[PDB]
Structure 1
Amino acid sequence: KPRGKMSSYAFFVQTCREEHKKKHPDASVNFSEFSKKCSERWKTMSAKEKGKFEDMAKADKARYEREMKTY
Structure 2
Amino acid sequence: GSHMGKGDPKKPRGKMSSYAFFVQTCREEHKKKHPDASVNFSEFSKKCSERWKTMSAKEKGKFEDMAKADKARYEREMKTYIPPKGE
Normalised TM-score (structure 2): 0.65
How many residues are treated as equivalent by the alignment?
71
Aligned residue number for residue 36 of structure 2: 26
Structure 1: give runs of 5+ residues left out of the alignment: none
Normalised TM-score (structure 1): 0.76
The CA deviation string for residues 25-66 of structure 1, in whole angstroms up to 9 with x for no partner, is 231446664222111111221112111111111111243223
Distance 1:31 1:8 in 2: 15
Q: 1:22 to 1:6 in 2, by over 3 A?
A: same
Residue of 27, 36, 39 corresponding to 1:17 = 27
Identity %: 100
Runs of 4+ aligned structure 1 residues displaced above 6 Å come to none
Which structure: larger Rg?
2
